[PDB]
Design a binder for this molecule. Sequence first.
Ligand SMILES: *[C@@H]1O[C@H](CO[C@H]2O[C@@H](C)[C@@H](O)[C@@H](O)[C@@H]2O)[C@@H](O[C@@H]2O[C@H](CO)[C@@H](O)[C@H](O)[C@H]2NC(C)=O)[C@H](O)[C@H]1NC(C)=O
Ligand SMILES: *[C@@H]1O[C@H](CO)[C@@H](O[C@@H]2O[C@H](CO)[C@@H](O)[C@H](O)[C@H]2NC(C)=O)[C@H](O)[C@H]1NC(C)=O
Ligand SMILES: *[C@@H]1O[C@H](CO)[C@@H](O[C@@H]2O[C@H](CO)[C@@H](O)[C@H](O)[C@H]2NC(C)=O)[C@H](O)[C@H]1NC(C)=O
Ligand code: PC
Ligand code: ZN
Ligand code: ZN
Length: 392
Amino acid sequence: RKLLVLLLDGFRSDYISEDALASLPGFREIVNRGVKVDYLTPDFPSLSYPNYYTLMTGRHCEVHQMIGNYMWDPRTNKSFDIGVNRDSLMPLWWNGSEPLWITLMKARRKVYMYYWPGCEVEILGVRPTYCLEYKTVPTDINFANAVSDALDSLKSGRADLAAIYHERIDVEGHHYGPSSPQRKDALRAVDTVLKYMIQWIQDRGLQQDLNVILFSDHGMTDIFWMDKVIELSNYISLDDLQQVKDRGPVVSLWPVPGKHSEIYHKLRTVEHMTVYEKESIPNRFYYKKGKFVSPLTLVADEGWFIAESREMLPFWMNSTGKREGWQRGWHGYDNELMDMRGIFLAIGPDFKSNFRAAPIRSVDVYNIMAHVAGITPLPNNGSWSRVVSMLK
Ligand SMILES: *[C@@H]1O[C@H](CO[C@H]2O[C@@H](C)[C@@H](O)[C@@H](O)[C@@H]2O)[C@@H](O[C@@H]2O[C@H](CO)[C@@H](O)[C@H](O)[C@H]2NC(C)=O)[C@H](O)[C@H]1NC(C)=O
Ligand SMILES: *[C@@H]1O[C@H](CO)[C@@H](O[C@@H]2O[C@H](CO)[C@@H](O)[C@H](O)[C@H]2NC(C)=O)[C@H](O)[C@H]1NC(C)=O
Ligand SMILES: *[C@@H]1O[C@H](CO)[C@@H](O[C@@H]2O[C@H](CO)[C@@H](O)[C@H](O)[C@H]2NC(C)=O)[C@H](O)[C@H]1NC(C)=O
Ligand SMILES: C[N+](C)(C)CCOP(=O)(O)O
Ligand SMILES: [Zn+2]
Ligand SMILES: [Zn+2]
């Protein structure tokens, strides 16, 4: 039957703990009438673009190839800069595996996507039926309207799958911290939309024709500027680097020829991070085989933040003029950290009700989505055994 998928960026698993659900009527109703996993473990790195593609392919990042929010290809000398630069639209970055919406389009199913990062790309020669492109952070009004519009498109048969992306829980987790009232306010707004979404589904006659799946790409943890900042320019010269990508927990480095060993050994001494040669990256990350993975990768300890320098931190615009706001939450760290856990819930004719499911991994979600959408999944890294018991 029809499928509505909701991606809630940055939604940490314990945001809907038992204690939290006592004041979250929308999620409480989904929990009471559907499926909730204890938590969703993301892929490494626990960043957006990697986990977006893990969720929609069922494959680890070393397979689908989207291994960072920021990536560089030495062959073409082109960059993927968290989807902003025009070259992010190159199928080079996206053709490493076929995501579910492309498979559905090629099976002549109709797909509507709202603000979903990636829907604006021609992937493997294909695009979804409809894409409302992500431009800025969507507002809570944008979210409520997309949910209503998606239900209309599913009811009218213009869409078989509708997929909606919402960012603001991530933004407030970053700007104010995961335990902040600002983050809780953004969650409350989503909870209220979901409460009425349930009413809209019933009221428009879709309750028996529609499953709804909700998940997140990763959780969120506290960071501690300026004490817990690692300034790379205190240890190595940028002149010894061909390229550097990203700041924060996971940083990709490409040394100039002849400086690989020196950069490696110099950064090996730095406390509160780990530097890995590509061949020595922990196998459990299912990351090291990706073609875009850099010769050296830095992984910060939880709560620490790697940057070129303090003055080069990603300050945010909390005021009119220059960006001076400190970030208070972040993610990207070791994907087995409790704070990096995300969520998965489901409700509808094909899911059990009031069912607490064991924790699953980001790679497990694709098989579920494909099953209830009625399409054969492409071979992937999900475990059917880890998810099968939530289905009716
Ligand atoms: C915009 O932010 C600056 C920087 O201060 C950061 O301090 C943290 C509390 C963090 O939450 C982050 O949001 C915030 O941006 C604010 O200036 C700072 O104000 C504090 C007291 O609130 C002073 O102790 C600091 O000395 C001062 N630092 C600087 C560089 O000004 C600023 O108030 C804020 N602007 C607005 C309009 O709120
Ligand atoms: C997916 O995108 C890649 C990147 O554009 C395509 O491969 C490139 O294009 C041609 C294919 O032979 C070559 O000249 C390039 O060297 C390729 N670059 C690579 C492979 O990194 C690929 O063909 C696309 N696949 C589909 C099905 O459209
Ligand atoms: C994750 O799944 C992918 C896709 O099924 C696996 O990659 C395939 O592995 C077989 C066996 O070596 C190859 O014949 C295919 O060509 C591979 N496909 C791709 C797209 O790479 C991969 O081995 C799985 N990873 C793990 C850790 O189980
Ligand atoms: C990629 N994005 C800009 C749409 C969302 C935020 O990215 P991320 O901080 O969750 O990795
Ligand atoms: Zn995210
Ligand atoms: Zn984020």
